[PDB]
Amino acid sequence: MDVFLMIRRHKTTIFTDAKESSTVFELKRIVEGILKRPPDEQRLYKDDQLLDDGKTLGECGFTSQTARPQAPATVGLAFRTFEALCIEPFSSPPELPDVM
Amino acid sequence: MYVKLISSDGHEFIVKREHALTSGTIKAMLSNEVNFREIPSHVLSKVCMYFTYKVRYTNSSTEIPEFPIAPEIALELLMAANFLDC
Amino acid sequence: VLRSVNSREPSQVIFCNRSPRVVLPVWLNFDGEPQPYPTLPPGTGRRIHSYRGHLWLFRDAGTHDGLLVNQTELFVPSLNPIFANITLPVYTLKERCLQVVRSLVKPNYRRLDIVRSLYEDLEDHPNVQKDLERL
Ligand SMILES: CCOC(=O)c1cc(=O)oc2cc(O)ccc12
């Protein structure tokens, strides 16, 4: 079963999917192919919690009906000592026009 | 194979290449990074969410859910979608 | 041209609304005129008595947005009941945006800050008669 994710670090945001049965380390292999960083220099997070390499995305709370295509779940990324988990927020939308 | 779509505020969105080829405009601006001077991150992130949404539910039999658009981003997303023809 | 065939052969149909919209069923009579039927709340179904060769299309009852039935625009009851699976289509991002903006701004359309061609897109509401000439 597919889960749809946003892997985010600093001002980087990767849109990808993975199997619910796939492991955290296997996600780091996906990140490795894109950002060219080995998994040992990678740290994956759900919100603030550090994720274990051997656990599957489903055990980590990334389920199909919470990681939707039109609303993907966020996986925090941190590079290596290790930096602190930093995710730059998106820009703020303007005020609603008077006609809305 | 991936491509980078950079918003106006520096945010870098890395999506699959075939997802970005959905928009005919983005294919032209690639023919591999693309900068969007007029699309902020709170609009381009929604655009990338639509790429996954379109590819997943096109030619699909399971019930299709509504693509959610907050009111505060509807006007900007409309101009971006009109420009990108997506 | 787009009209129902007066075959007088009954065909039992189940209108199945698998969409978050209020579905307005539209029967095309023997002169091509669109005839509206009672609406279906989201997720609700209805057993209707139609006929073979008859033409049905379904829209959003409030906004007349186009909807799919069995992954197509037109639904024709055949020989027996036949399931009429009404679902949302994969709207383009532009049309989906027009839908949301239309639902928030009163047809104050010109007061928005957009290009002039976007005002005409907002005013060009989805309409059954316009789509009939298209098909
Ligand atoms: C009124 C401020 O909003 C914009 O100017 C704008 C926002 C956006 O997200 O995408 C655009 C695409 C365009 O081609 C032209 C303009 C925009």
Author numbering:
A (entry chain A): 1 to 80, 84 to 103
B (entry chain B): 17 to 47, 58 to 112
C (entry chain C): 62 to 141, 146 to 172, 174 to 201
Extract from the study:
Two cullin-RING family E3 ubiquitin ligases (CRLs), CRL2VHL and CRL4CRBN, are commonly used in TPD technology. These CRLs are members of the multisubunit RING ubiquitin E3 ligases with a cereblon (CRBN, substrate receptor subunit)–DNA damage-binding protein 1 (DDB1, adaptor subunit) and von Hippel–Lindau tumor suppressor (VHL, substrate receptor subunit)–Elongin B (ELOB, adaptor subunit)–Elongin C (ELOC, adaptor subunit) (VBC) as the substrate receptor–adaptor components. In addition, ELOBC is an adaptor subunit of CRL2/5 E3 ligases, bridging a substrate receptor subunit (e.g., VHL or SOCS proteins) and cullin proteins (CUL2 or CUL5).
To determine the crystal structures of VBC in complexes with coumarin derivative compounds, we attempted co-crystallization and soaking with each of the 25 compounds (2–5 mM of 25 purchasable coumarin derivatives). Successful results were obtained using soaking for 7HC_1(DE22) and 7HC_5(D3), and co-crystallization for 7HC_2(D7). Similar to the previously reported VBC structures, four VBC complex molecules existed in the asymmetric unit of the crystal. Our molecules bound to the previously reported “ELOC site”, to which some small molecules and cullin-2 (CUL2)-derived peptides can bind. Met105 participated in hydrophobic interactions in all seven ELOC structures of 7HC_1(DE22) and 7HC_2(D7) (chains B, H, and K in 7HC_1(DE22); chains B, E, H, and K in 7HC_2(D7)). Hydrophobic interactions between the benzopyran moiety and Glu102 were missing in one ELOB structure (chain B of 7HC_2(D7)) but were retained in the other six ELOC structures. The 2-oxo group of each 7HC derivative formed a polar interaction with the main-chain carbonyl group of Glu102, and the 7-hydroxy group also interacted with the side chain of Glu64. When we superimposed our three 7HC structures with the VBC−MB235 complex structures, the ligand-binding sites were identical.
